[PDB]
Write a protein that binds this ligand. Structure first.
Ligand SMILES: [Mg+2]
Ligand SMILES: [Mg+2]
Ligand SMILES: [Zn+2]
Ligand SMILES: [Zn+2]
Ligand SMILES: [Zn+2]
Lengths: 589, 589, 161
DNA sequence: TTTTTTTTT
């Protein structure tokens, strides 16, 4: 038995990272300045430094984590005594455990060991408080004594009350003292296994996890997470007998990750290429041949515009795309790709969705009997992208429920005495088929689309796809067979890098409109409106929304190159893509 | 060792305000005269008077507050000995606490400290009575003795049954004596966080607060309030075990303020401008170009007329506006602005509203099994404005629920054995699209509204918005791009001061109609009757309702200028707006 | 004294007051015990007694614990024949709509009618009641907080319109 | 009762 306090302190103060910058030393300095009370340590770094120390953490976790925490606290306290009286104790969280076990393959032998499970977050409860050291008071005409009930031991998960007063050795009834009671933050969350690991013909399983102290509110529902902790059995109602000697299992989370400097460096050099826009466009759905104009439209929606928030109103900065095409034009294929490359996306279908499920659902809690709100698909997609396949297959009474969310980006509910307004800032991508399955060229556009003009005006771009056999069949057939043969197109940015690029652009880039782009947009909008009045029979209308669309598209093109201003070149591209949308719908320019 | 009783009396008596009038001395004088029993003290005043006094109260409020009550009570006692026999003790309340913490950021370290939280009140409980000192009689044939149970401390939040009789030392049965029991007023309320504070993709949280003594019935649901007090853990079934030693927190209210003398001067001098009405109109929706005539109608609805109450009937004092326009005419943008600038407004949509949610909903308590009502959207909007967007999309079974509210300004509830009639004196602002999306001029208004003719009879003014691409496209395009570029319109009233201006006018201004003014309305209304018979095919009928509506519009104009008298210039202005209403609806004169 | 149904506070309990409101619910006439008669079921006792001795029987129903005659505990059986009853009726009073403040729901108060006061008025009428307020007790034995109590109304005289 | 998805007169 050798003390690990010196080794742990030596590891923190002597470890050299990629640049030999003493990364953990910097983390301590950040911890002291911000009073973060939590430290994150990569497991592979510990193993590289001292393999014996890594072994002890994995197995002897129950009786070595407090030892390291105490040593770390003294080092921080010595570094800055002001840190004391503000933070009582610090936490050491280990990340990178080699022991990873699937949610469905958890057995009895894994209880009591530090393991890692990767899944999808589903439900998060409001933050509550847990008593870990009580303070009772034996009220009895002779006692008038208070005491901390659990002596030399943390309070168990089961609320237990003293039977014999330690101060007088007598029974009676005791009264809790909230003022002297010590509390710790407590949150309950539910994790679900990923859809790619569920066995065939079976519903996904669920596991209950517990977050405490600073770990509360570390993630939102729908996030992909990696949790490391100790499994344990759950006790709910042990007071009443009746067998039920079978218990569920829950998880005590010690460290949690969601979904770096090197990545930012990789992204920065990518935008240096003048043809970065073409590379991004060609990297959208590499398995689909052609449809270049469609690929550009989907790329713009991934980046989006710049939302504007003023003192009196706000203007949305999301781009909505609608695709109408004959069956077999692969429309669902790009939509599936978009839901996989976007940092945050939700995939829905017209037939399998309802008005309540898309925006918000009011459900009665059977435990208390009072109504409460449940987030819909659009609410869960706030700040992301919502995909609605088969938009024409849903009832018009249900489709009309998203008119407010698509423009005002808010959901208003007045039901069961509940008045609320939830943000739904999400970009909507929709696809569907014409009225008669396939497009009828002889018939006009009004009866082919079979959609009200109100929802049509809310879409920035509308593309009509027609499957016309011709001279391009041979090249299309060769491309499809090459995909089935395993051949892949090179010079394509991978999904993981592309997803990182999109997230960085949406966070640190905010283009501004210049004077040159202002004149070009104004001239085109005025000219576009004049031609619209010539033929008023078209279902589509040129409303002031289309003017907003040009600004959003112009910003999206600039954001793709990580530019700071909307130059003249970006304005031309916005006009060019708008011309194709107008030409496809039947309006010449 | 340092006593602050003298400092408290010194601070109350020797404090100089900005007017140098000893406001706190006047507050005590007002308290004694009206038996207020509650004193409001700003924290900033104490900080200027003495830093040590300010630091003590904000930190040690648990013990200093009872001490400060005695010094105030004695000073009031010597000021007026008759204060006794009516009020046993007074209350001192501190406001302006700088310890402001967000609702979602509350942690374990904040329990037991004086903090303040800003939120929205959503639920109020009927006033109840709480026991703080009980009296029991020992039911045992030897005792027949009455004793107060909690000796040397207050009754805790959990009622405790004495087990041993203090007077005789014998256990048995005890009977509560309500005659000698001490009671205190008790109320429960729920606070919800503001929509602007909710994180992306999450749902708003709630916190339960407790109001006691004079703090009961100090607010109504839907009001934004700032509440200060001490947090504590909630106990529901301490006797009943079952593990789950996790407790939710609740707030003990000590001072509550809903949502002022320099602003009074700031609004009175503003009305001195003879062009104040023009400036107010130009300040409505500054981000919307044009629509000058429709902006005037919205301003009138913000102020409204003066209700007339007779010995048998009441005359509605509110103005109802219906807006029908093509998609993309910014109908929803100004409705959002109206809901934000009005002192009390509720925003609802046609698809997100139900009949129960608009008027009242019954809720069955799980415990008692009793039905009780909940406030609907219209009830919460009483005394304010109710905004109903996309009124043409709501189901007719829910549309009939507002027919009584528009005309009778009342809501009748007869369900689940509960019969009541609620007041719904709220102005209704509604918007909707034409029957065929784009308005058709050649067809009449009846086949374009897609609404029953009955509901349109209750609307004072109806406006038609037309999106016709013409020479104004360039001006509109330039204006929109200016908004997106950060450019703002100057010489306009800010929203915060505009809301204060509207609230003052609706409270302290009651214009009176002159005899000469009545001549114009009576003469004008006669000419409408002649034209009604000339063209009886119009869907608009010249009823006595139009005569009543004309009076309200003139009264609103006078209230806009803070004038207590209705001159002739307001009557002609009311005539002009009615004429354009008839011109837009197709009745050309 | 006349007090609005919404302005009732803690200081008004135990004093004669007058409330004006609208009847909304009337319960069927029932009987209440003010002096019960108990028989000790113990193979030696066979004794009859009135448990609420020298005191009116309270609202809470409490059975005797020790036999006043034999001086021993056991089983006590109530005798409906020897007991004395009194007419009992429950009703709910709702405040007038004109008294309701803006944007609030009307309050309700529970009143008790006894003896000849039963069936004095029908639901939907306007009445003015007089009497003494008191708190409501349902299950004082059950612990678990609930230290707050509601207030009901005992009617001594009621007039209609 | 009231909001929701579902099979059923
Ligand atoms: Mg498809
Ligand atoms: Mg709208
Ligand atoms: Zn003891
Ligand atoms: Zn006794
Ligand atoms: Zn006996």
């Amino acid at each position: 038995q050798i003390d690990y306090r010196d080794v742990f302190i030596e590891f923190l103060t002597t470890f050299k990272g990629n640049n030999n910058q003493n990364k953990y030393i910097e983390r301590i300095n950040e911890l002291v300045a911000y009073r973060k009370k939590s430290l994150i340590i990569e497991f592979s770094d510990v193993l590289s430094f001292n393999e014996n120390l890594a072994y002890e953490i994995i197995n002897n976790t129950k009786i070595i984590l407090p030892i390291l925490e105490g040593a770390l606290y003294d080092h921080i306290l010595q570094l800055d005594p002001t840190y004391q009286r503000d933070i009582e104790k610090v936490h050491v969280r280990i990340v990178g455990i080699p022991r990873v076990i699937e949610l469905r393959k958890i057995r009895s032998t894994d209880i009591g060991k530090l393991i890692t499970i990767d899944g999808i977050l589903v439900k998060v409860t409001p933050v509550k408080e847990r008593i870990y050291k009580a303070t009772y008071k034996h009220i009895h005409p002779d006692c008038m004594q208070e005491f901390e009930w659990p002596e030399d031991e943390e309070m168990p998960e089961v609320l237990e009350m003293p039977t014999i007063c330690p101060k007088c050795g007598k029974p009676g009834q005791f009264r809790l003292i909230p003022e002297k009671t010590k509390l710790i933050d407590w949150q309950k969350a539910v994790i679900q296994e990923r859809p790619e690991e569920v066995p065939s013909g079976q519903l996904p399983r669920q596991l209950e996890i517990i977050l405490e102290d600073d770990l509360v509110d570390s993630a939102r529902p729908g996030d992909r997470v990696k949790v490391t902790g100790i499994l344990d059995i759950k006790q709910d109602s042990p007071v009443k007998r009746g067998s039920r000697a079978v218990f569920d299992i829950y998880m005590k989370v010690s460290s949690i990750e969601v979904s770096s400097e090197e990545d930012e460096k990789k992204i920065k050099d990518l935008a240096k290429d003048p043809w970065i826009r073409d590379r991004i466009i060609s990297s959208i759905a590499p398995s689909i041949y052609g449809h270049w104009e469609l690929k550009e439209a989907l790329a713009l929606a991934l980046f989006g515009g710049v939302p504007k928030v003023l003192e009196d109103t706000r203007i949305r900065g999301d781009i909505h795309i609608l695709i109408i095409g004959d069956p077999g034009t692969a429309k669902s294929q790009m939509l599936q790709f978009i839901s996989r490359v976007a940092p945050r996306a939700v995939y829905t279908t017209g037939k399998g969705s309802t008005a309540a499920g898309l925006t918000a659902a009011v459900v009665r809690e059977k435990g208390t009997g009072e109504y409460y709100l449940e987030a819909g698909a659009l609410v869960l997609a706030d700040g992301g992208i919502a995909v609605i396949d088969e938009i024409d297959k849903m009832r018009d009474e249900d489709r009309v429920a998203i008119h407010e969310a698509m423009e005002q980006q808010t959901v208003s509910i007045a039901k069961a005495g509940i008045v609320a307004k939830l943000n739904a800032r999400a970009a909507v991508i929709a696809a569907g088929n014409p009225k008669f399955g396939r497009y009828i060229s002889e018939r006009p556009v009004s009866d082919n689309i079979n959609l009200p003009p109100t929802i049509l005006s809310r879409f920035d771009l509308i593309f009509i796809l027609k499957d016309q056999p011709g001279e391009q069949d041979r090249e299309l057939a060769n491309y499809i067979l090459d995909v089935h043969s395993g051949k892949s197109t090179k010079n394509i940015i991978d999904i993981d890098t592309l997803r990182k690029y999109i997230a960085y652009a949406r966070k640190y880039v905010t283009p501004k409109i210049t004077s040159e782009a202002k004149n070009l947009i104004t001239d085109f909008f005025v000219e576009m409106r004049k031609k619209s009045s010539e033929t008023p029979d078209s279902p589509i209308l040129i409303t002031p929304r289309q003017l907003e669309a040009l600004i959003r598209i112009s910003e999206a093109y600039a954001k793709m190159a990580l530019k700071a201003e909307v130059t003249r070149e970006d304005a031309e591209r916005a006009i060019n893509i708008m011309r194709l949308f107008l030409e496809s719908v039947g309006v010449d320019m």
